[PDB]
Amino acid sequence: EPEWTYPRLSCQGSTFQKALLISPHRFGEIKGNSAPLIIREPFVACGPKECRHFALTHYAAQPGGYYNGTRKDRNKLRHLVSVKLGKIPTVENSIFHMAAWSGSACHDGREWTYIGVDGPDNDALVKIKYGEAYTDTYHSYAHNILRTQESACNCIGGDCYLMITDGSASGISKCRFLKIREGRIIKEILPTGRVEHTEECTCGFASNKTIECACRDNSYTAKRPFVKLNVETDTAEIRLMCTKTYLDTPRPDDGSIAGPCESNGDKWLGGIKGGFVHQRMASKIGRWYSRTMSKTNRMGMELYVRYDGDPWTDSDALTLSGVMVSIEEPGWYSFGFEIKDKKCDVPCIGIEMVHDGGKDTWHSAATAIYCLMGSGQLLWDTVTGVDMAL
Amino acid sequence: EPEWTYPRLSCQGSTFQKALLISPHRFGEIKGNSAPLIIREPFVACGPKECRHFALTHYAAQPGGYYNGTRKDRNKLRHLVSVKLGKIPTVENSIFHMAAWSGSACHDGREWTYIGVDGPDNDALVKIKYGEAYTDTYHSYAHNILRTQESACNCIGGDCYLMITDGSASGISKCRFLKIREGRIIKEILPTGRVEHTEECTCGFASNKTIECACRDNSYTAKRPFVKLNVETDTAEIRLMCTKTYLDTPRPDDGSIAGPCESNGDKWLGGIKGGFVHQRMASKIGRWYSRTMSKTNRMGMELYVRYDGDPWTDSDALTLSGVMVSIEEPGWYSFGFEIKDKKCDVPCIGIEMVHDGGKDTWHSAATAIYCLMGSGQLLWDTVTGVDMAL
Amino acid sequence: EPEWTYPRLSCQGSTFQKALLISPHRFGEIKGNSAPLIIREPFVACGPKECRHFALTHYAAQPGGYYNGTRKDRNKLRHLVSVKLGKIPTVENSIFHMAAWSGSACHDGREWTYIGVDGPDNDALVKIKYGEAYTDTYHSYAHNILRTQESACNCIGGDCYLMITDGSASGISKCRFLKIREGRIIKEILPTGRVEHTEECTCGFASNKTIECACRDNSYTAKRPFVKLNVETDTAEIRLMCTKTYLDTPRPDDGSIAGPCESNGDKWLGGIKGGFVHQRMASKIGRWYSRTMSKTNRMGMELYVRYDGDPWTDSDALTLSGVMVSIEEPGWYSFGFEIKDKKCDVPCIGIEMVHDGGKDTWHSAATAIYCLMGSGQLLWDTVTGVDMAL
Amino acid sequence: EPEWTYPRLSCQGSTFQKALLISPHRFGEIKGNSAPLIIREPFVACGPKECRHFALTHYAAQPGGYYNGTRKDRNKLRHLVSVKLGKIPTVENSIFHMAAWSGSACHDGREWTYIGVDGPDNDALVKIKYGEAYTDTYHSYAHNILRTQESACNCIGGDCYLMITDGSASGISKCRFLKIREGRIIKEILPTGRVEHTEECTCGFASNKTIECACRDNSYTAKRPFVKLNVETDTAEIRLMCTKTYLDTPRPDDGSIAGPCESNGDKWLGGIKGGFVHQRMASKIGRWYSRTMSKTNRMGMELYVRYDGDPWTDSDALTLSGVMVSIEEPGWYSFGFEIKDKKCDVPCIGIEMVHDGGKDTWHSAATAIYCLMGSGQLLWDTVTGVDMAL
Ligand SMILES: N=C(N)Nc1cc(C(=O)O)ccc1N1C(=O)CCC1(CO)CO
Ligand SMILES: N=C(N)Nc1cc(C(=O)O)ccc1N1C(=O)CCC1(CO)CO
Ligand SMILES: N=C(N)Nc1cc(C(=O)O)ccc1N1C(=O)CCC1(CO)CO
Ligand SMILES: N=C(N)Nc1cc(C(=O)O)ccc1N1C(=O)CCC1(CO)CO
Ligand SMILES: [Ca+2]
Ligand SMILES: [Ca+2]
Ligand SMILES: [Ca+2]
Ligand SMILES: [Ca+2]
Ligand SMILES: [Ca+2]
């Protein structure tokens, strides 16, 4: 009988470097003989023995004949699939866990937990799966597209925590947190503080007592709402990050937003999921973030870091760590996960590189990875190498 | 040495929701690069560690060149194949267990048992397989298409029970039950009661002492013959279900059949295999059934439920639970199986969604799944998303 | 540490029935999307946990571009490959063990032993492989196409026995036997008796003290040379079978060969590998043989059996058991192997069904299987279902 | 908990024979249905239970649409992939370990260690991976294409040794050695002696105290620099081999280079990685080398051997052992690895057979293997069997 998964100290290191790239459409030529699935919202989650590359497929492949609708998000064909990290997600390589248009997954040291959301926008549903068995569900509370993270949930000692949210994308979406255990929701936490809008949270353990999240506000601010969940008391609390380096997209020039740490500024309506991961140290804490290069568009991607301080009250601009993707290459959703080494965890940042060619063609993505290893500075940037017209 | 499989209490819950969809032909475009097998009569069966998606292939794929004959049922090329639940049944993903045009399978907690039927219609044969070894056979008694369930057999404490049947589809087909153990038939039970016609039974444990089956009568009634097998004495007994919600197809308006619980009514010649599964509770019993939406055609699919009572004498109409498939989408064979969680069994209903385009083209099917999870009502319906002309 | 494999009593039963068919070219249409390997000389061998389908590929696939030369036998591209029994041997499904144009394999209860032959016809070489390591070799003695069985070698208590042969196909080819152990040849046996010609032997355990073989004589007789190897003393001895049902192809009418059990009769130059397997009983011994239906051509295939007696002196015609393949369907090489059940061995007969369309096109084969199971008579025959022009 | 890997005595034998060939492009016809990856610099490395076929892919396949650039070496798309030895490295069969344009790997008896190099030529990076976790990095010291072996690193008792090098290909490239343990570099050795140029080293254990390497000098000599690393003191030392059979390409006639063992002779600018492996004996040492057949071009490949002596001072010409590849067939990079049998190691020599058709088409390679087994002489040569125009 295996033991439960706990957050440990991150491995020694001080910089991020190009780790691996997964460009399934470098094989989808009309001339080729492969069949990569058309997907979006990819994310990596790892257990003690393996890392898995999850994603949301449109139950279609390239080359294929159902490209129409792949640019849309919610529908009755969307499914959450996954391949082992390092394998091209093809029709046969892949595994379909369930039907869903929003999802998350996390391993608890013993078994996998898959989360999926599907159903009518006004009464959607969150379905928990433990291994091969469907174990539970959660209903919509705001009755407007119940959705989840699009990144790994976080398990500790057997209890897993997962952010959920219901509401308008241009209005109010108060997020919620579910304390899931062995597939069954044993609790539902109501966060305190700034909650006008909080979705697509990238959560991770800052320690054995706290989980933090860098989220997305789609209608009020270019600042990223920041969650701090006290695992010990299952209580949460949110409030806009205070640094000058706004991590959302779109966003105004750094420092452009006048006022205290709670000022939303101009709506800058819209947003994007941002990478975020922790570097746990015996007496210090590293916080790595990623943000698109273009301020208005999803192009490029840079890495930031800030050791210690309270993101809630620290307005000091973050430290630039590197360019993971140039402005000529797509830089869309991003996320964090942590590989488990023998005695330490390895913080990494995955990046969704969408191949957008309009609604008239297929719409898929590549997944570039970057992990903490060694010292110095980020050396190389990433490219998908795909030519959509093939 | 593993221990034997026993039926346990179902997991807590009170509604069925869309679980997973397997549409292998969403990848069989002339333009694509995949190779899904052309099949029919799919069914899921699970062991303690995994669920497998079995089916009957025509040893052909799409796109391919042997579409002629795939709409026929019995032949020398038909084989029983299976992939793990969650994988697309393709030429390479699949495993061929044996040659057969009728089949069943069930895991006994230790090893898989595959059942296959093939041979001349007048002297067909039932072949039992235990793991990789061919272990036994059973001959035709009525000498007219010896056939079996097309759904999982049920094992308890090591002994597995399987319904078989021989006879005319428009005449008399007295079914039989085989008590198989470790691949060898240690008994053959002769059911009592209504037996003029009883085929394609969907059986499952109602408890540790009884196995129940919702079967098909192809020539006498629109009511479903109902089997109750006393596992403790290996004795059976059949008699037409008594509810007003006739579960066969075709069928007349509910309550249309005048008379007592034994009235067959108009022949309504023909039928279809219907889903059926048990929800075991400490002091109550849930019985879930499925029936096509159209009364005359195999279109649509709805879920029913009836807690307690004797289906043999209860004429009270079943309770509508939801629409798993609309009348615009194919709703063919259906069936039940139960996923094994750590401490409870999860009742599910699989549905065969055939892609019928006439005998002039390929004839294959998708498999939509629905499982008990959480409460409330069924939220979403299922679609194959396939456009046969591609 | 696993224990060594020993021959046990066969499972109870008294007839052979169609078990499984492997027609990889039912997916090689120019229109399809699969890639089955072009092969020949297939054979199945099983260990305690799995059966494997070995064969000799021309390192080519259908559809493909290297069909020229596939009808030839020996060459520098031929490799011995294998897939698990039940999987289609495709480019990706397959595993390449070594380069060879003649081969054999057998599992000893602990690890697999692969045998391969390749090299110049005048100085060919036999290479033994144990798992992933190349362990030994044996040189040509007659200096004319050193070749081996094309069926499984037989291991007992850890020592494996394998027939080898060197010589002209139309002249003298004295076969030899190698006692291999853990990959290394610890002995070389020189058979006694009739040895003018003895190749492609189908060997199997008649007991814990004797291995028997039905072989092929390519230039002297239509009778099959018969080997009896005393495992206990590692001594052999050969002499033409004495039944009237000649099992070679070509062959004259049964009983046509005048004289005693040693008469070769007319050369009937040429031959074919024939199926042969043992049915071990507490006090009786079943011997099953297969022979093409046509006397002059490789078409059709029938099953024979003879309980007890000495094939060396028994001239009584064998008992016809059934038609595994009609005269309209190809019936080429055949062979025997035995599946291992929990407490008994299951004798089976595999059949090579070649798709011969001349040297101007591809030349591949299907593998039909038949195993002992239950009683009565053989019910169905086998067909490849392949239309070479697709 | 498994124990550490140590070098043992090689298995008994005295000759090399054709073992296995991996020609993935025997399936890349425009007409076929397969997808082999376009690669280069292949190499095999084995652990106690399996051998893996690593290589450097251009993230492209045949047939495909990105053939331009595959003839170039360094780029942002190159990745180190690997399949189990015996499987065709296809898009789906393969696993991508990391992004790199130079690499190495070795198993330490417990877990795999993958090494990859990528980044700007002037500030490249060496990334160590232990299983699924990124563990360490090493920076460029000469600031000119930091690169590594292109063959397996060598682990002993848990510590693994890997040659690295930085410098000009036509100038000075002083190589370095990294003592890696559990993914982390615990030491960096600076070799003594001739070091003007030393790259692409083929290293292997000559004993439990010494690792030897046959390297490449790209700008000064046709003689192969020879490394001897004292594992016991982690000290190294290099000096040009002294035999008359120059093993580099290009090279002048044997014995053409006048002078003592340290004479570089004419630049013969350029080189190639050469095969080299040890045959450990109780009291003797076999050293096997390979060298292209043509003196000026990468065509053909022959095997050499020299028992005992000091390659540093022995000028006696090596003993010709055989022709693994004729002058009509490509003979490019070559390398050594050792399969692990139950009680001994099996020395083998892999050969890279590039399919060069100019920069206007794809550029991929086949991998022919040869291993020590039995006695006598090398019997057969190897051919790719590929016709690039298909
Ligand atoms: N309002 C949103 N942020 N929605 C949203 C926006 C985008 C985009 O801008 O590209 C993509 C997907 C979604 N999503 C959906 O459409 C339903 C689920 C969800 C991703 O799983 C949001 O979590
Ligand atoms: N009389 C029947 N119910 N036969 C039957 C009917 C249909 C259909 O109406 O679609 C499909 C398959 C069968 N079957 C066969 O043709 C042989 C086996 C069997 C399914 O495995 C019946 O169990
Ligand atoms: N003389 C023979 N029997 N040779 C022979 C004949 C045929 C045939 O008639 O179809 C096929 C293969 C072979 N073989 C070869 O060509 C080399 C090896 C061997 C099969 O592995 C013979 O064992
Ligand atoms: N100077 C060299 N020897 N470079 C070199 C030469 C060739 C060739 O001549 O064919 C091929 C690859 C490389 N390589 C590169 O381009 C970067 C890494 C490396 C192989 O991994 C050299 O180790
Ligand atoms: Ca925003
Ligand atoms: Ca494939
Ligand atoms: Ca009916
Ligand atoms: Ca003959
Ligand atoms: Ca040189």
Pocket test for ligand 1, best of A200, A355, A359 (most atoms within 8 A of CB): A200
Phi, psi of A122 (to 5 degrees): -80, -15
Strand arrangement, sheet containing C334-340: C16-22, C364-372, C345-355, C334-340
Q: Is B241 helix (H, G, I), strand (E, B) or coil?
A: coil
Q: What distance in angstroms lies between residue C371's CA and the mean position of ligand 8's atoms?
A: 26
Q: Which chains touch A (3 or more CB pairs under 8 A)?
A: B, D
How far apart are alpha carbons C103 and C147 in whole angstroms?
8
CATH architecture for segment(s) B1-390: 6 Propeller (2.120)
How many CB atoms are closer than 10 A to CB A92? 20
How far apart are alpha carbons D54 and D67 in whole angstroms?
21
How many CB atoms are closer than 10 A to CB A149? 29
Contact C363 CB / ligand 3 (< 6 Å) = no
HEC assignment per residue over chain D: CCCCCCCCCECCECCEEEEEEECHHHCCCCCCCCCEEEEEEEEEEECCCCEEEEEEEEEEECCCCCCCCCCCCCCCCCEEEEEEECECCECCCCEEEEECCEEEEEECCCCEEEEEEECCHHHCEEEEEECCEEEEEEECCCCCCCEECCCCCEEECCEEEEEEEEECCCCCEEEEEEEEECCEEEEEECCCECCCECEEEEEEECCCCEEEEEEECCCCCCCCEEEEEECCCCECCEEECCCCCCCCCCCCCCCCCCCCCCCCCCCCCCCCCCCEEEEECCCCEEEEEEECCCCCCCEEEEEEEEECCCCCCCCCCCEEEEEEEEEEEECCCEEEEEEECCCCEEEEEEEEEEECCCCCCCCEEEEEEEEECECCCCCCCCCCCCCCCC
The C-alpha angle with vertex A13 and arms to A7 and A17, in degrees rounded to 5, equals 105
Q: Which amino acid is at B224?
A: R
Interface test with B, best of C14, C26, C371 (most B CBs within 10 A): C26
Q: A134 catalytic, yes or no?
A: no
The closest alpha carbon to B147, from B224, B215, B207, belongs to B215
Q: Which chain D residues are Cβ-neighbours of C66 within 8 angstroms? A: 26, 29, 385, 387, 390
Q: Please give the DSSP secondary-structure letter assigned to residue C121.
A: G
Q: Which tokens is A108 given?
A: 């608890």
The residues in D 149-208 lying below 8 A from A, measured between CB atoms, are 182-183
How far apart are alpha carbons C26 and D169 in whole angstroms?
53
Contact D52 CB / ligand 4 (< 6 Å) = no
CB-side exposure of C260: number of CA atoms within 13 Å?
4
**C-alpha C232 chain-centroid distance:** 24
How far apart are alpha carbons C277 and C335 in whole angstroms?
8
How many CB atoms are closer than 10 A to CB B279? 23
Q: Is A114 helix (H, G, I), strand (E, B) or coil?
A: strand
CB D349 within 8 A of CB D302: no
Q: Please give the DSSP secondary-structure letter assigned to residue B17.
A: E
Check residue C177 and give left, alpha or beta (phi > 0: left; psi -120 to 50: alpha). Answer: beta
Length of chain A counted residue by residue: 390
Question: Which residues have CB under 8 Å from B33's CB, separation 6+?
Answer: A32, A33, A34, A35, A61, A63, C33, D33
Domain boundaries, chain D: 1-390
Contact B29 CB / ligand 2 (< 6 Å) = no
Q: Which tokens is A233 given?
A: 């008391």
Measured between its terminal Cα atoms, the distance across chain D in Å is 50
Buried/exposed B90-124: b ≥16 CB within 10 Å, e otherwise: bbbbbbbbbbbbbbbbbbbbbebbbbbbbbeeeeb
The closest alpha carbon to C362, from B9, D19, D29, belongs to D29
Which of C35, C98, C134 lies closest to D33 in CB terms? C35
Question: Which residues have CB under 8 Å from B103's CB, separation 6+?
Answer: B41, B54, B56, B80, B114, B115, B116, B117, B148, B149, B150
Q: Please give the DSSP secondary-structure letter assigned to residue B378.
A: -
HEC assignment per residue over A293-306: CCCCCCEEEEEEEE
How far apart are alpha carbons B196 and D96 in whole angstroms?
61
How far apart are alpha carbons A275 and A373 in whole angstroms?
17
Phi, psi of B144 (to 5 degrees): -155, 85
Q: D90 and C95: CB-CB below 8 Å? A: no
How far apart are alpha carbons B32 and C261 in whole angstroms?
62
CA-based R_g, chain A, Å: 19
- In Å, the largest CA–CA distance within chain D is 57
How far apart are alpha carbons C98 and C96 in whole angstroms?
6
Q: Are strands B112-118 and A334-340 parallel, antiparallel or unpaired?
A: unpaired
Question: Which residues have CB under 8 Å from B356's CB, separation 6+?
Answer: B71, B330, B363
CB D37 within 8 A of CB D67: no
Question: Which residues have CB under 8 Å from D77's CB, separation 6+?
Answer: A21, A23, A26, A383, A385, D58, D59, D60, D69
Phi, psi of D289 (to 5 degrees): -130, 160
The closest alpha carbon to D106, from D337, D346, D335, D342, belongs to D337
- List residues bridging with C125 in a β-sheet: C118, C139
Check residue A308 and give left, alpha or beta (phi > 0: left; psi -120 to 50: alpha). Answer: left
The closest alpha carbon to C214, from C274, C261, C270, C260, belongs to C274
The residues in B 38-57 lying below 8 A from A, measured between CB atoms, are 46, 50-51
- Give CA separation, B375 vs A125, A127, A133, B13, B335, in Å: 11, 11, 16, 6, 22
Q: Please give the DSSP secondary-structure letter assigned to residue B301.
A: E
Question: Which residues have CB under 8 Å from A160's CB, separation 6+?
Answer: A106, A108, A113, A153, A154, A179, A180, A181
User: Which numbered ligand comes closest to the C-alpha of C202?
Assistant: 3
Question: Which residues have CB under 8 Å from C255's CB, separation 6+?
Answer: C244, C317
How far apart are alpha carbons D177 and D229 in whole angstroms?
9
Q: Which amino acid is at B197?
A: H
**Residue B261: is it exposed, middle or buried by C-beta count within 10 angstroms (0-12/13-18/19+)?**
middle
Give the method used: X-ray
Find tokens 């299987």 and name the residue: C369
How many helices and strands (H and E) does chain A possess? 0, 25
| Breaks in chain B listed by the residue before each, with C–N > 2.5 Å | none
Q: Is A26 helix (H, G, I), strand (E, B) or coil?
A: helix
How many CB atoms are closer than 10 A to CB B252? 14
Which of A61, A139, A182 lies closest to B27 in CB terms? A61
The C-alpha angle with vertex A368 and arms to A365 and A369, in degrees rounded to 5, equals 145
CB D290 within 8 A of CB D304: yes
The closest alpha carbon to C106, from C346, C338, C352, C345, belongs to C338
Distance in Å, alpha carbon of B367 to nearest chain A alpha carbon: 13
Pick the catalytic residue: A114, A138, A333, A370?
Answer: A333
Question: Which residues have CB under 8 Å from C64's CB, separation 6+?
Answer: C35, C38, C362, D27, D29, D31, D32
Interface test with C, best of D8, D26, D49 (most C CBs within 10 A): D26
Q: Is B25 helix (H, G, I), strand (E, B) or coil?
A: helix
Q: Are strands B238-240 and A364-372 parallel, antiparallel or unpaired?
A: unpaired
- In Å, the largest CA–CA distance within chain A is 57
Q: Which chain D residues are Cβ-neighbours of C92 within 8 angstroms? A: 34, 87-88, 90, 92-93
How far apart are alpha carbons C93 and C164 in whole angstroms?
29
- List residues bridging with C335 in a β-sheet: C350
If you measure CA to CA, which chain B residue comes closest to A99?
B20
- List residues bridging with A280 in a β-sheet: A285
CB A53 within 8 A of CB A44: yes
Q: Would you state the torsion angle of the CA atoms of residues A380, A386, A387, A390, taken in this order, to the nearest 10 degrees? A: 160
How far apart are alpha carbons D127 and D100 in whole angstroms?
9
Distance in Å, alpha carbon of A329 to nearest chain D alpha carbon: 13
Phi, psi of C333 (to 5 degrees): -65, 155
CB A123 within 8 A of CB A143: yes
SS3 content of chain C, % helix, strand, coil (to 5): 0, 50, 50
- List residues bridging with C39 in a β-sheet: C57
Strand arrangement, sheet containing D334-340: D16-22, D364-372, D345-355, D334-340
Question: Which residues have CB under 8 Å from B170's CB, separation 6+?
Answer: B218, B219, B269
How far apart are alpha carbons C211 and B65 in whole angstroms?
46
Provide DSSP, A115-152: EEEES-GGG-EEEEEETTEEEEEEE-SSSS--EE-SS-
Report resolution in angstroms.
Answer: 2.4
| Breaks in chain C listed by the residue before each, with C–N > 2.5 Å | none
CB A246 within 8 A of CB A317: no
Q: Which tokens is B201 given?
A: 């039974």
How far apart are alpha carbons C352 and C333 in whole angstroms?
5
CB C380 within 8 A of CB C17: yes
The closest alpha carbon to D127, from D111, D114, D141, belongs to D114
Q: Is C150 helix (H, G, I), strand (E, B) or coil?
A: coil
The closest alpha carbon to D276, from D213, D197, D367, D370, belongs to D213
- Give CA separation, C237 vs B115, C193, C211, in Å: 43, 5, 11
How far apart are alpha carbons A286 and D339 in whole angstroms?
44
Phi, psi of A25 (to 5 degrees): -95, 15
Q: For ligand 2, what atom is nearest to the CA of residue B270?
A: 9
Provide DSSP, B94-140: -EEEEE-SEEEEEE-SSSEEEEEEES-GGG-EEEEEETTEEEEEEE-
- List residues bridging with B203 in a β-sheet: B213
Report yes or no: A65 at the B interface, CB cutoff 8 Å. yes
Q: Which amino acid is at A167?
A: G
How far apart are alpha carbons A106 and B113 in whole angstroms?
34
Q: C65 and D29: CB-CB below 8 Å? A: yes
Q: Which tokens is C148 given?
A: 């081996």
Inter-chain CB pairs, C–D, below 8 Å: 136
- List residues bridging with A35 in a β-sheet: none
Contact A74 CB / ligand 1 (< 6 Å) = yes
Interface test with B, best of C14, C15, C20, C375 (most B CBs within 10 A): C20
How far apart are alpha carbons C225 and C217 in whole angstroms?
7
**Residue D307: is it exposed, middle or buried by C-beta count within 10 angstroms (0-12/13-18/19+)?**
exposed
Contact D101 CB / ligand 4 (< 6 Å) = yes
Q: Which tokens is B301 given?
A: 């699919």
CB D163 within 8 A of CB D169: no
The closest alpha carbon to B21, from A55, A89, A78, belongs to A78
